[PDB]
Symmetry: D2
Subunit: 477 residues, 4 copies
């Protein structure tokens, strides 16, 4: 029941409150030691072997630091230690709902296995937090340190997910955990207004440390010049006008990361292969949940006791199996182990403001196969031999400019906020803020099938009006 100290390779030595220590030392939280932060990227970057455990620790520490600084430099906000504990707990448990290989589970697998439900890992995080609190007798411990569980659990849940109860924007306050007087406390762990939060800072630093790519953003300088100001009967976190350029750079940094590591094409195809292996391995793996009931890999998100035992272990559970009824997924994983991967064909961009919707992906391989090239190639390829991948690259707000939703204050008048437009900053800033990319892969790896795949790709690219391949003079001359 004393302050603990833990050493971090990203931050320094970190202090942990006894209640935080109690929360951490449970099976539900310890589950995070066995889930990769970057999923399949570890198969392209050999140094990316870190897990969500240290990421959660860092996010909690940074949330605590930011709230402490805000309270210290401006003591009329009425920030109490109860609020500090609540914010730290919310930051600590914000990723309890990630599945095997993180985003691959909720970005690729669940959509294809159970296409009738809508599910995100934040909902899973809320459910897992409820399960953790109920199964470990934590409410008395919270009451022992001055928390009020009925209000505070709701406050933490609303910190992890949106306002909840669905919105009705007729000039109303949607939240319930805290009054509007402290609305800024909802902008720390996850910022729904412009996307500036400590989670980005933490994973920027940690991913740059582990990948071998050097980071360019400085969050301590941002914390130095941060303030709280009243805007439109709404207290929000504001930066200083002289930091505006830095903010732009931050988003640039994020984009760069997505373009170098998270959307690497070999890593993406490896993730696709793992998803296909899981799809084939389904209907045969059993997980025991509450009441001795059995669950599927796809239905395990309906029971937290069963979901607690679903980690990256399942991967090695399929590779080492001997059951003759799991042979196909085992063959796929073995092919992964030999680097016999699906081969990349080409890439393209839409020209105009036309975009591919989510519910139109399944037909793309059919249209690539259905094309009729002019040149006559010997081999014929079916629509089952093609994989089409769509990538959405934006600044986090669907072609909106995030910096237009930030408030700024001047040195001479620190208690009044303003807005800055893009033309008041620089002429060298980007013009657009969202785009799509399309990659095409072929499953048949014959040196002959690749030529046919390229011919169909170029014909489909030409007739769809989707620009032309970069190397239109090298691979298709």
């Amino acid at each position: 029941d004393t302050m603990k100290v833990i050493n971090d390779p990203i931050h320094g030595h970190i202090e942990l409150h006894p209640l935080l220590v109690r929360i951490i030392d449970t099976p539900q939280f310890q589950r995070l030691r066995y889930i990769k932060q970057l999923g399949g990227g570890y198969y392209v970057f050999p140094g990316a072997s870190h897990n969500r455990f240290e990421h959660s620790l860092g996010v909690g520490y940074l949330a605590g630091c930011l709230v402490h600084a805000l309270g210290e430099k401006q003591p009329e906000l009425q920030i109490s230690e109860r609020d500090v504990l609540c914010v730290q707990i919310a930051g600590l448990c914000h990723d309890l709902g990630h599945g095997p290989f993180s985003h691959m589970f909720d970005g690729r697998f669940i959509p294809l296995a159970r296409p009738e439900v809508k599910w995100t890992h934040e909902q899973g995080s809320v459910m897992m937090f409820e399960h953790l609190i109920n199964s470990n007798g934590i409410k008395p411990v919270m009451e022992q340190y001055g928390l009020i569980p009925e209000e505070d659990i709701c406050f933490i849940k609303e910190q992890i997910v949106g306002p909840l109860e669905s919105p009705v924007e007729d000039s109303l306050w949607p939240y319930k955990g805290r009054p509007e007087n402290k609305s800024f406390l909802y902008e720390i762990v996850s910022n729904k207004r412009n996307g500036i939060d400590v989670d980005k800072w933490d994973y920027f630093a940690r991913d740059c440390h582990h990948l071998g790519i050097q980071n360019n953003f400085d969050y301590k300088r941002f914390i130095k010049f941060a303030r709280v100001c009243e805007v439109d009967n709404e207290l929000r976190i504001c930066a200083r006008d002289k930091e505006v350029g830095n903010l732009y750079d931050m988003f640039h940094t994020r984009n760069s990361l997505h373009r170098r590591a998270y959307q690497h094409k070999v890593g993406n195809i490896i993730d696709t292969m793992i998803t296909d292996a899981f799809l084939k391995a389904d209907d045969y793996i059993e997980i025991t949940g509450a009441g001795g009931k059995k669950y599927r890999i796809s239905t395990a998100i309906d029971d937290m006791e069963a979901y607690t035992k679903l980690t990256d272990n399942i991967f090695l559970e399929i590779l080492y199996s001997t059951d003759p009824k799991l042979k196909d997924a085992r063959e796929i994983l073995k092919q992964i182990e030999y680097r016999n991967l699906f081969k990349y064909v080409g890439e393209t961009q839409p020209t105009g403001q036309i975009k591919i919707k989510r519910e139109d992906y399944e037909s793309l391989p059919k249209e690539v196969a259905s094309a009729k090239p002019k040149v006559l190639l010997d081999v014929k390829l079916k629509a089952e031999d093609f994989i089409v991948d769509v990538i959405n690259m934006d600044y986090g707000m669907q072609e909106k400019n995030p910096i237009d939703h930030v408030s700024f204050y001047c040195k001479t008048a620190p208690n009044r906020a303003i807005r800055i437009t893009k033309n008041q900053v620089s002429q060298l800033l980007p013009e657009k803020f969202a785009e799509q990319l399309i990659r095409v892969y072929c499953k048949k790896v014959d040196r002959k099938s690749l030529y046919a795949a390229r011919q169909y790709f170029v014909q489909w690219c030409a007739d769809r009006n989707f620009t032309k391949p970069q190397d239109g003079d090298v691979i298709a001359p």
Copy 2:
């Protein structure tokens, strides 16, 4: 079949020969992605989640770099590209035989489970290298690049392990892979004379990067001033006389690491608990090997096909099990998951150089139990409630001075080596080079049992003529 580039957060961008790529892309080598470098230390240092895969990559790269530099600066040594390839292959496969949690498997488990055999992970590395070469059709590929497999496989094996075939030192050359005039090539990956090799450099850098501690050794400076000289009809690697102090510091660094991370009290007790869980879980886990035969965790080192599937996965295989025959090991692992660990009692050193030998460990708990305090508490304790751990801290040569087996050359006469004694360097250097420590833990966490545990500890420590317990006045007033 072209040079391949890979990015490492320790060494940067690294080039790989196509034969190396063929060797890497096999199940036997890909096994190393699922075994941690530090084992249980990951449960004390949250950033130590790296595996043997990147360590092997780095060791191979550094071996190649050192041999290239030596060849470049001395063109009369007759170093060929065949030798470079062989040395790189040997460095790449040096830790190919580690088991689950690395040194825990061959340091704690095998000795207790099968105490009639003598086994090290280098023998396993040799066996696994043979299995890898035979199971993947590599000999033709080696022949394609100018290697002679019958000589070169023996050379690589002799690089990984000692001279082999038992020694008879009557003025003879024990090795077979290479003649006498290439002997220095046996000092790169593993140095049996004084212990200076690239493996130490690599894990120093990597462990310090991941743990959050900065190292003070520079190996590039050492490579700059390295040379090859003839000593007693033996060609060996020599450093320059001005680097002697640096060499001492290097060993100091190693000791410091062992005293901070590798021999941490909580990490060691966690490793002990995991070993106990594996001991109880044995006789119930089955692994399929060649011919459809079944193997135990302890007997899996007798078949390489079965050994290929034995990784850290087994840990999570026991925790998630439902078989009633595995309840005890599962209970122990669950205890670990709650931080309900065995409690540390005390520590001591032998003063009179009466080093406790290996075959006296099992009786130590009896001696701690079988000891009558003067004061009476009436709580009692069986000998089954005590854990005694013996730690050997040395400079790698069992109380010998390693720097006495190093050769040095001067600037004016670069082609003649000399020796330097400890009194020609400094008076502030260590006077001994080996020591022992003894730690005691109790398996009952009652606030009452802890007091009796330390009463027996102090009585037995006083009895055995050892030192008095440090800071004893506080815990034993």
Copy 3:
């Protein structure tokens, strides 16, 4: 006469040829130990106290590394050790002509003191190299190591400066040092087609290390994928087509640095004050040159012996002086020592494609003073109380896109180069590549004077059809 090793905090240990050591150990080169790399920026960033000596060392080392790698990977280019020595010498002596406080000497002082000559520090570098070679007896030493002085001195000079003796582009080869089949050797130290050279890499790394701003560019990866290909009967350095995005990022990095450190407001005004102090201190400082002749600060660029003694020392020579004729410059420097600096008024951007040319700067303060604001204040400010600074921010080629002059090759056909347009890369790239900024400062430092100065500034900005003052509703409401 043996290879020398030197330790660098940016790179590692660096090897130096005996001829390089002879060149370094001369007064002309040792002069660089007393000129700062960033000039007045040291008065805003306390860690920027490095000089040009280490920068020159690093540039030479990197030039050698790049040429060595290019020769190693393509034996048909016929790169000899003579070329390596010549390139290293050119990289080592590329900044011999910098004056006190580096860019402010040839960017601010010489233009204002002697506005009838056109002078850059590269011409000074060539003259100083000639002086160094002639006054130290280096030609026989060059002949001792296989160099041919008559051709090689011209080659080095043409490496430091352009083709020389003016061009006539009627399909001719302008250079003389080397034939047309080694033209790529002219693209290493200073690149004229685009701005990709080792000098940028070196000062990026060093300035990021010293300022406390972290770097984002990786030049080793660039060296890994570099190649030489024939383009339009020109042998040129081409990059790998998958690195195009990285190249864009590089220029972004450069811009960021200019926006954060090199064009800081307070640093620029401090440089302006130092330039004014030097202007007033002239007519009174005497420097002895060849033949016992005396020279001025402004006329010292006409004699290299006199120029050798002109370093940052002159600064402290004025501050510690006692002559009554140097009193005004001493007062200005003393005011600098108290942070009684000229106060910043405002900033603005041109709206359209109109730009302020060089020969219109002197009249700008008159225009600002001559403006008639609407509201009336008692205080009247003359044109002598205003300072106007014009900043040009571009990608190094005056609103042209540098990436349009880069050549790329594909993996399948490594011996044929291609071009990539901006629309084949991304839609998030900048639209324009150059812009101007205008800052205004006032010399009178009382509050009424500042209010009046900003009234004139806003009136003039409105009059001349420029953008809004960012704080158009805060400081001017």
Copy 4:
């Protein structure tokens, strides 16, 4: 009059109180921008170009951080903001008395130029602090922020230097700035009991950053486990018992630095040459002080107004001079500029516990010359051709063990301290804690002179009962 932020490459962004800003913006403090931290070491390590300005900033910041942490974690000590300001000011102004090239001014020059006075740079720091406070009207500003100048100036002075007023240890409190119940505040900036203070931490970090050698000490961990406890009716700073080994390592680190950078042979001989040049240049340089009086380089420490203008500038003042009376020192500096340095002959250690005292250095070269070697030597060397340098390497307390004066506390009883002996820690620790080294250099640089010099060196070493030369079988066979 607002908190000011400054960016540091060693620490992060640092906050500065307005009073600190007023103190910094004065000529006396700004003088530190032109004195180098390592003196002549910059001529061996090209990256060591930093000055005392940033070192003072860092020391002040770290003192503030430590006092803040101590006050925060233990609020019964009654630490006020007045104490924080006083401690920060003391840390900020602790090196105001350093002269040109720092330690060589008060370590080599003053002893030889004025052998009748005893002078250290801390006395100069106290005098310069008095001059700064009196010449800039700071007392009213201190009164404006709650300080009491009469007590507080004395407190700061006693922080920079010892107790003052000469000691009489008959159970009395020697200090006067603060009462006996705040005594721990005297252990922060400069620790006279055991030598553990923030100044060591700062220059460890900064010198490691600039030299290119990685640091091994972590001071943040030390601050985490620091506490204040009553020892013998004396409140003192105590560490945690588990950190004892770390403390040893810290001192090891210090020794290593002294053995690598600060006592480098070439750096020391360069410092000796600069000292000789200053000795010859004296009697001819005039500095103006108070009342229009003129002072010498050696007598400038008697007037603070004259001392304010004495920096490294004097170096370049002699090199660029034209007066015929300064010709010898100019020749010496010019010889330095060519690397025509005094040549190193040999090194030796005393065998027994006999040590060379300070007042026997002048006769050492006479003893070396007066030796009569047996072998026949061609040339004869006078005693003016020899230089003998004596180096004392200790742990900072004249062969005493510093760790014997540290107090420790246990987790169970955090309010009562203990002592730990060297045998309770490890058997691998050093046996002795101080030693002496003697280097010999020759001024005549021809080969015959070097051979003769080493013949005399070996004969004298044999005579004086010293350890034989390391390479006694290489250079003198």
